[PDB]
């Protein structure tokens, strides 16, 4: 029972719940195709400071059930809601990275901002990644179709190539790649379901969060790297911070997509300052 | 609970069950020393086409319990039956790779071909791998004794060397090894039980499936690479296809042992054509 | 349920229990930051000889619950007692490596030597690693603070650097590193909780077992490498063997910390001789 909850639809969601029971809560939502382990640097920082931290694995990711369907933002939000309802942690600060930032926004829209004191979108997918007739600066759909085809063709290799190349900026001049960071990304991706991750690409890239964002009146902090090769800065973080009612943007100059790892100390300090504000 | 069943002898068997509940079913049985993750390319292909796919982890392999005994084909077959019993998927097409093809044969013989509509043996161990005074064309037992000695001596290194060398033909000139494929094979092996896998060598190499095969009258498709360095083509698939009553052999010229990965597109197309036949 | 027990404080402990139900039992206690998989070479050796072997994963390690607190030797001992109580294996020989040797000592002290026939401390942390007024030759606390800072900074990379360097002596001239051994150490570490492991450094380095050791009257064997870079030989095994009432020391000349792996055949032989004595 410690660290698992079963949703209404029979999906087992794994979670970490660390720290004093009566401390202020921060709930973290990870990106594609990873797990709650991707927050390790943040979870350790906060728990060592006396806070309570919660972080769960999205359906079909990490240690959560390899359910074949429901791989969309509405289900992701409801699965998050199942964790919050079990733990009684309403009023938490909710922090998302990448796809997880979409999940945070949909959680707020679907289950109500009364239950979230503050939100943070780190390197997050909103408002809409894919190019459409009404989103002409987006990324062409074929880009995502190709990510899907890579997952289908050789997921094992693709999950080395992404973290070795664009995700942490290890393909840039001056980069100091960490083999452990690369293999750790891979390890998390591979324990998840190929089907959940394959469908998951559509969920993150082709869900429009613009309406959800506009309904958010609670304090929102947006943190984004301006050399993000995975979720382009100009078409995500910059827009999200303006669409919400009470948003603020912190730009990490030169930073990649995987800033919870590469810029952990900055992220930790910025999250703490926002939590205490 | 989703994706586990406890057998009547107390073993928890992990499985994936993906796709529409009323669709035609394909059940897949993996090889040594791997897990149901070895079928990812196939599972994704079939689920995306609207079929229902089931794939379980052998006892002591993958996410299934590290039970110390019963590492033989009869128990492997009985563990498969426990999955089919829970899910009600009698009448499925059963597909085995490598050791898993032995499991499929023993499952049919022990639980009855009335419960299987069609069977596919990919790179599979039957009829009898090991050389005996009465199987003079087989592989000397010393070979399998040496595999066991390597498992006992340094399993972690052995499980890099096998996929980096003979399993996918990456030791052949001009081959393009995939680091991710090699590490994924390793990852699946190392999560399983050293004892299950040690005993499992005997199970796959020293079980005689000849009588079981002769009793199979349902349609059987045999797929086998003629450059298979792990299960020699001439003493396995060539023979199995002739021993069953209604068998057909497809030979993949040049192909290694790990054809679900290296020849995924051919496997998928051949499996689909047979399923629809 | 095969292989899991839930403690009084709600922690799920993973264990392996292999071999004939009525055979003499050997219970193994692994080191930091690993799991019961670190014992593979010993478990296989003894089960193949017809003994019963038990090995559990420490809280927040391996497959055990990622509980945030109780990362201290008293709780480690109590969690081990939970496994013994479920299995009824009182009277076993208890073998610890590294941190696990401390856990064996505190288990004996807290739960009583009446429940342990013989104990073995391989490369173990007792009596006390850190420098103090009464342990003047111990390791400065700053060394352990620095380990904790590495875990906090980049656990993924630190867990390659430890096994690739000091743990197996692969940093010594003429050493023959095994990539599989290095990655397997890493694999075990990363599946555990960063918090359990961060706190666990204090538990192993900063717990005084002197009075526990002085109270042990059962036969104790200490095995320790004299080139151990992780737990210095002169301030650990040499002392523990003299503080217990009935202790014997076997020194492996030139040997590193990771002797269950590097010196497996010697360890297996010395354990079997002690067990039969």
Q: What features would you highlight for this structure?
A:
homotrimer, 277 residues, alpha/beta, Rossmann fold, 8-stranded mixed beta sheet, 10 helices, Non-heme chloroperoxidase (chains A, B, C), EC 1.11.1.10 (chains A, B, C), AB_hydrolase (chains A, B, C), AB_hydrolase_fold (chains A, B, C)
Short account of what is shown:
The structure is a homotrimer of 277-residue chains. Chain A has 277 residues and is α/β, with parallel strands linked by helices.
Give an account of the 3D structure.
Chains A, B, C: Pfam families: Abhydrolase_1. Chains A, B, C: This is Non-heme chloroperoxidase. Chains A, B, C: Residues 25-259 form the AB hydrolase-1 domain. 3 copies of one chain form a homotrimer. Chain A is α/β, with parallel strands linked by helices. Chain A has one domain (1-277): Alpha/Beta hydrolase fold, catalytic domain (Rossmann fold). Chain A has 10 helices and 8 strands. The first copy, chain A, has helices spanning 40-48, 73-87, 99-111, 141-164, 179-191, 194-206, 210-214, 237-243, 259-262, 264-276, and strands spanning 4-6, 12-18, 25-29, 52-56, 93-97, 118-122, 220-225, 247-252. In chain A, helix 8 (237-243) links the parallel strand 7 (220-225) and strand 8 (247-252). In chain A, helix 4 crosses helix 5 (179-191). Chain A binds chain B through residues 6, 10-12, 65-68, 151-161, 183, 186-187, 190, 193-195, 198, and chain B through 1-3, 16-19, 37, 40-41, 43-45, 47-48, 178-181, 183-184, 187, 261, 264.
